[PDB]
Symmetry: C3
Subunit: 274 residues, 3 copies
Amino acid sequence: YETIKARLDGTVLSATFNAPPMNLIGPEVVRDLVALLEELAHPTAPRVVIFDSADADFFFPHVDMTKVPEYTAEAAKAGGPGDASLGMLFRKLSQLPAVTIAKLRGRARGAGSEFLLACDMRFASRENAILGQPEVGIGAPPGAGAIQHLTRLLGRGRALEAVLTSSDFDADLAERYGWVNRAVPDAELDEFVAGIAARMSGFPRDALIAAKSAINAISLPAPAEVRADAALFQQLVRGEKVQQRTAELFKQGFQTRGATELDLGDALGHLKAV
Amino acid sequence: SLTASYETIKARLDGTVLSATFNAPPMNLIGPEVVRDLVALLEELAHPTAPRVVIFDSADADFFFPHVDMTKVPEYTAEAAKAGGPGDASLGMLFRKLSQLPAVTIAKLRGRARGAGSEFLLACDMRFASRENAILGQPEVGIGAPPGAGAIQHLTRLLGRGRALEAVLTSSDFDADLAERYGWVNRAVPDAELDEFVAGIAARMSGFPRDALIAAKSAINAISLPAPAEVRADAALFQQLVRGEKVQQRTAELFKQGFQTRGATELDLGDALGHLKA
Amino acid sequence: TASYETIKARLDGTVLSATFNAPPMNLIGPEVVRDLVALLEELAHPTAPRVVIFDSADADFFFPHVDMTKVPEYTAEAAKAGGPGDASLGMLFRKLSQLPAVTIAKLRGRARGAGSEFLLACDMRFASRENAILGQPEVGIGAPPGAGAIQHLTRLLGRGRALEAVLTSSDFDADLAERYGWVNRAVPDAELDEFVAGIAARMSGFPRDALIAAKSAINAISLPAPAEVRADAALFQQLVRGEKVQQRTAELFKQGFQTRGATELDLGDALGHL
Ligand code: NA
């Protein structure tokens, strides 16, 4: 794919997001993810997919704020009527027959964090993984699953903290809060994740699918709630207050590889109230 | 900076951040005055131009709230009723209104918060506790009733079944570090850093769009709060057991040893309960 | 107090210490299930002990898993505890969870499969840092866990960590089990007996109706519905009928399953070699 480099080692696929300049989630990333999910639904597809990033500093910084309609239209192609949202695409990711493992170095914010949250397991580099939900600070509630996943993983208090402060969390704090399964030393992370994927590679396909389906049924929101979250994000992200705050962010180097994106959580605290 | 302040709650507004300090001597028992003032504060905070964020703390040297005043239950329940509709005459329903406020609420804990005191903190949006001096507990079962103002609903969700059964059924006191490990508080913070930490959190949210804060909070609450019927059921059961013979006898024994005074029984109530003889 | 063939019981005031002792290796077989059914009946009485501490007499195991050579027999025993469609360890363990008596599982050594599910059905779990091991080997063999691990682990661990524990079928030490939420706390082995005795003692003088009321209210929020317990069992049964489970179970027996060898001592690892 244009934005996803795939290497298949047995029944384990390594899918690497490589969408220069900085791995924004735009229409091409979404299009290629839609195509990948279609492939991974095949009976003889890999049992396990490991997701990682080719970018030095980011997994995904967030969605491309200049292409919201465009990436939304790509996301719609994965679903049926009512599913024109990144949120419903990430729901399909969560329900995939393949076991998905997110391996995080560097920064994953906004829908970047939501992508990780939709995967089955998250393992993060202690030294360099950073998670955040900048959406509220910019001016919209998270629209692709953070509300649904974080509330269940973190519990009410910690989810309110993460979502409403829009602050950045290092890997150790993310582990303590439950946002990732575990923080692992950077030097051990690749081997640790490869080993886990190798565990499951030899297990009966139907057992993996049955157990995952059963756990998902208990722990995923209903589609109505996913669609409601997306609709409210889609409304507020087009609103005047978000326009003004995003305009200030653009002046300060938003969607460039600089201080604003590297330390976006901090940057939001300096924005003038609208 | 116009904002109401009350006999038992010292409230002041600095921009869009309200600081509200509970100060109800002699020892911050949740009595009718505290409940009345909290009812009034929650009504004020429903206004669209009200503060984005409220920081709650305590003026008391040793307690946030020790628990409810067990000598004034009908009187404080009557005050609590004024916050809601028919069937909402309970601290549980008052604390549900607190949870659902448009304002983001931060509980800053030093010293002891037990019973309905812990339940107040649990109803707030975020809890940050002094590592050195914060203590949490649910003494209700040890006295002889299940918690009646939300601890069952909140702790089961935050702690999970096993740890909630441990906390509620043992009525033991938890220090800040263990409270954090169990999920009763968001984080334990060194005492010397706690004020600045909480101020920073509040300052973050102070400049964020009001509608985004409210939208996100409301959606999170929808997933994680009980239904009103469950809150009312929790309250009903507590109000009846606090009048059964065992609670009356054990409460009387506790009063004999200094319950509702600033002494060993209240400073270490978790321990006191374990030594009461059946 | 009553002692049983496989459950050695001592009553001290209002605290019952019930020790599982079913040689050669504490498999959950028909005798264990029979005796557990009888014990649950006794513990329903108004003047039963307020608290029960469960432990094991076996040097290496709490319960390794069920005796897979006696499935009809132990199932028939479990059936006696419930109504139509309750002939499952899942429903038996639900009855355990709903007991008026407070149950504390004190874990040394290995508890896997339905052994872990027994512990999960108890009210509190405290584990020896040095020697407690937990695992759900079911997916590795080829079915989702059928006796409550799906329902309990998803709630206690959250989606990500539950998917990890269930899909990997890996063994978890006490410290990791505590971090993930599978046990309440990990305690040094030398302190574990005193710690658990202290917890039981806290509750010994508490009003019976308060303990029962609070436990019932917590269970109502945190237990699955009976239909979901029945469905967990049925899903396990569908997959267990399949060729892969039959084949992999046979290979495990060929490698010393249900004997005190490497396969049972280190079952998590053993599944990876199939
Ligand atoms: Na948790």
